[model samples]
Target chain A: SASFAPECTDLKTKYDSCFNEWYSEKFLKGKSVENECSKQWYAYTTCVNAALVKQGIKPALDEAREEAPF
Target chain B: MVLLHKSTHIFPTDFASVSRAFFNRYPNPYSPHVLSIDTISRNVDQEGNLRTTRLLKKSGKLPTWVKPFLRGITETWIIEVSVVNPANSTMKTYTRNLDHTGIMKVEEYTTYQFDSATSSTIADSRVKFSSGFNMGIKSKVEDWSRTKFDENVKKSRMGMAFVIQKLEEA
Candidate 1:
């Protein structure tokens, strides 16, 4: 499936590839660079969260966050 | 509507391998319902645990049996929170839907412990579900969802195992 917003699909894909490397080659390998791809992550999420407002899912997301089920 | 399921899976692999596979179990053949995932945040707790929160979007082809009312729901988002403590060889995650709150709210929890005693990983996956419809409609919704939930989770176990093999080969 694509991203919640069509505009962010490619952005999300780029970030996902970066993180998979960070997870496999870095995090799983114990390289001590958890945030090595933070720049990509931050960039992608900024675009994603912005799209939520246009679709009215932003408010429901808050409801989901407030109830930590752990 | 409300429903629940408890699942257990054992992986005869090392903790790091299993955890790595768990992190990227999406985009696999078994779960086309999952569309995309985004990192909401990642941080370390005071106790040295790795904490990650993510948002996931999923929408799959629905069966005709479940389309009476659920047909209106074309897409839904899931919020997943995970904490991993390698010191204890344990990983825990909680997930729930962020949309369709008025009709049904499905929540799930899972804990993975890599037991040194057995040299393997044991996962306990428990789910809880509920709905806000009238009693007559609620039971039917929960019943249908439970059926779908079982099929979904059952396949995911295979999905996780598939990634474990991929990680092992890599």
Candidate 2:
């Protein structure tokens, strides 16, 4: 059975979205803080962890989940 | 007088006439060294008078007058720093030295690529990986004289200076 890695996929989607949001605010609106790039990545990772926990998955906060190449 | 090739790779220990620091030991971080001279030819005609000719010669020598003057010029040092995270999947950044503040066009940027090919499975699936992208900027001091460059070098305390006006998605 080839099922989408729902948790991992969700993480990727959320990460991409978070990155876009951060780019818009930091570059366009000029509302940026220190280490904007690092902050954006961390924020995306945090969102993924929160989503995994909500789905009853034993979320791994130390590392990002590997996305499947289907 | 013509200036010829005058490039010396000074390590961290080299003396600097400008900054008196370790960073001046290396060449301009962006471009390689360029030292060439234009020479003119003169001929002694029948009248025993020297007549200058149109013949020109090119020599790659550093001027001798300036050699003694560069008794303690600084050198630039290369250090590798790691950038652990990037927004893209195929690339990673280890280190970056944004010394130049000029607004460079997109195509003018230098990119350092790292890749790996893997074929672990029998199905012949290939995987390509990249280390990341880095842009190189030439030192502004190279365009100025030693006395002037020394004054400019002081503006940067951390060996080099790079300005990040805005953030990119990367």
Candidate 3:
């Protein structure tokens, strides 16, 4: 239910668990929240993006950036 | 050749619920064509806004009449970039296909605006559809993609509504 990285799905599941919890329990209540998922998010993104970088997807991704929608 | 569109949609849920529901979207019965998503980058900036980029892989069927133009191209990729700003209680996302822009190009810009006053959410979508085919064919392809897109957007909202139920249960 997460992403393309194989082993990363394990972490993806973990991150979402925390994310879902934080969303309903804290954020939805309009409480000021820090990055509670910071640790797991860093772990998950760092591992998965490594594979993405090595796959040379940087080029095409930047091309997409040219038409930023902000 | 291009066709521009804009629509205002309302979500039954509040802003926070819908915002969180987005990343958890997909795999709903309505979106069998969505193959996968790879998170390219996620960062929380100085202002505590979360910026994200995700690469999406999908399997799409070409229109029967347009099949001759595109060869064995059922699989494609899309790039999505967004910012989740907690301070303003808003989210802005931009997404477009990464492959086969010549035949069909779709750029979608969506904003989830959370009105704290009413505790309601309003979503605005701005979509651009374009094609490089001959005049007649170009218009046809754009319309085809647009029709397909509108259906999917409706499906997406339903899916989001479904996700909220699951989130609330947790």
Candidate 4:
């Protein structure tokens, strides 16, 4: 849908990275130094991202803007 | 606004195990755990006796899901230790060296409402005014006992209570 293709594509790229990080860390509890909740943290972050995606909002971009000086 | 999720319990035992887990999950190039702050102090009473003190503080913000375990309270202190090479313009290197402490406080609050129909909880987040202090002492070339760390944790917990009470009254 051209209605939001560009924005959606950009968001997908952004979320893809977030998802990748979450995926990498999701199964890390047995192996990593993070506590038992690393798996939960991964799932939580992923769900948050998914919700933002469904809303057509770019959460990372929104956070970056909030942190920006300008 | 802070989003509060399920609570996660963090005890001393979890600290070591989690740190190991974190190392396994992430490709961290540095030491598994960075020594953020180490300090020693002495208390003198009317008896003129000196008591030595030691503390080690490391900081990281709790993940959202972990907030529920903390009774939905949003006040926490986090520490981060990053090595800054010249290439990393974002790095501040070090604020205080050897015998200095940088202290600050923060507050966050979050409430959640469960939608039974959807079987999900939605976050209604808020941030309250927060005021507290922290002192990070430089670590001497020695080890810190688990008891020392536990004491510091208790002290910080009490500080959060004091600040929240004062704010509510004000």
Candidate 5:
């Protein structure tokens, strides 16, 4: 399973549930073009980045975003 | 010089199943190098495509000759970006190493599409390898990476198959 930070797991789960529903029900079904779950996702990612910093891999994340040619 | 590799395969499954398997494909016996996977961010674009970014940790053994230049056991972090367009029945993924850019950098791109006529899912992949300042051994490094990538792709296919089987069973 894709694991997240122990402390961020709850937020991740909540965001995942919201996103999955939006993905299938709204995006996949062509019902909406806007992402209604972005608020939850942003909150979840903040916790994830903090955890990555604790692991000393925050630079890797920064490099990835910087070097993404596409 | 840059080395390129390409492959195509047809799986006896539908597109949705294949896509799900791809997302859940890790921690399999065939891929012992993969340590962990974490989703960094995900969102839907205005085009209605689902976009995702993930980070993966993998541990690999360096070659005897290269061991002196680097650590014996190298831990690499890969950043994977993917877009799923359900309307077009296509899923595209790109993955590259975030660490170890000085030694070598590899970029892999894969696309999965459903073929209604064949009633099967088709997967196409391309991998490109470029060496760093180690220009003297660039050819050798590219060759080694090409071979290793081929093996990795084979293992990945098997891993996906394993996941699809379990999904079907469940």
Candidate 6:
């Protein structure tokens, strides 16, 4: 799977590995206790946000989320 | 509650491959308009299904006739929610615009399931378009949207095929 932010590919790769494990081993097995990859996910998203800011898409995201349906 | 358009497609790929391709469908040549996609949230439901919400940004041109009415709004944000059930080998997704609801709202629902008999993946899609305007304008907009949706459906299928091809290569 490709990352949305190319600059954050390393972080995304780390998070994706953790998420896939959790998805197959825990989530698919009906164990919905807690997400084990949230920490990695947070780090990945922080990197994504910084990339978006650098690309000047942050303002557009803010406007788009203003009246978001969900 | 009138539907603007609906379609069904049968992909020769298996459900597992098709579902995997769905999440990796962006950034394909068939859909150059899709700028980016970000996962907003994801969780596992009590039924052992994975649920995810994503935000997508698409920038494209509008038809000349509809351009004046849009007031120079070309780019749009879309929200997509998906549920994947591994036990049954089924996937369901709902996508709609995040902004510009008053002018027009186009919502699409798609379901993908594995057909045991054919050993293929079956995709069913239904799209609805509505606007808070006069009937004449509503019909006009719906007509335009239907045409656009048809083109999008073709592009989406091709994009998925591309992804599936890459998966098979790997």
Q: Considering every candidate listed, which one attains the maximal lDDT?
A: 5
Task: Give each candidate's interface RMSD in Å.
Answer: 2.7, 30.1, 2.7, 21.4, 2.6, 4.5
Please, what are the lDDT tens digits per residue for candidate 6 over residues B30-78? 9888877777667777777778877787886767776556666788778
Interface DockQ per candidate: 0.48, 0.01, 0.48, 0.01, 0.47, 0.24
Worst 10 residues of 4 chain B by lDDT: B91-100
Q: What lDDT tens digits, residue by residue, belong to model 2 across residues B1-170?
A: 11111111111210111111111212222222211111112222343322221111111233344454333222211111111111211111111111111211111111112222321111111111111222211232222233322332343222221111111112
lDDT of 5 by residue, B1-170 (tens): 67789999888898777887877787687888887677786767777777889888888877676655666557888889999998888999999887777767888999999999999989998998876467336666776877888897899799999888987897
lDDT of 1 by residue, B45-117 (tens): 6776778887888885544656556555678888888988867878898888887766667788989899989
lDDT of 3 at B153: 80
- In lDDT terms, how accurate is model 4? 0.28
DockQ preference between candidates 2 and 5, better one: 5
Residue B163 in model 1: lDDT: 82
Is candidate 2 or 3 superior in lDDT? 3
Q: What is the TM-score of chain A alone in each candidate?
A: 0.81, 0.34, 0.78, 0.32, 0.75, 0.69
> Which ten contiguous residues of candidate 4 chain A have the minimum total lDDT?
A1-10
Q: How does candidate 5 fare on TM-score?
A: 0.85
Across B67-159, the per-residue lDDT of candidate 4 in tens digits comes to 433233322212212221111111111111111112222222222233344543333322222112211221210112223334433443333
- DockQ of candidate 1 relative to the true structure: 0.48
Show where candidate 5 strays beyond 4 Å: A2-44, A66-70
Inter-residue clash pairs, candidate 5:
none
Ranking by TM-score: 5, 3, 1, 6, 2, 4
- DockQ pick, better of 1 and 4: 1
Which CAPRI category fits model 1? acceptable
lDDT of 5 by residue, A1-70 (tens): 4454667767767776786566556665678767587787788788877788777668767767766445
What candidate 2 gets wrong by more than 4 Å, as runs, is: A1-5, A24-29, A34-70, B1-92, B95-170
DockQ, candidate 3, vs. native dimer: 0.48
**Candidate 4 residue runs with Cα over 4 Å from true position:** A1-70, B1-144
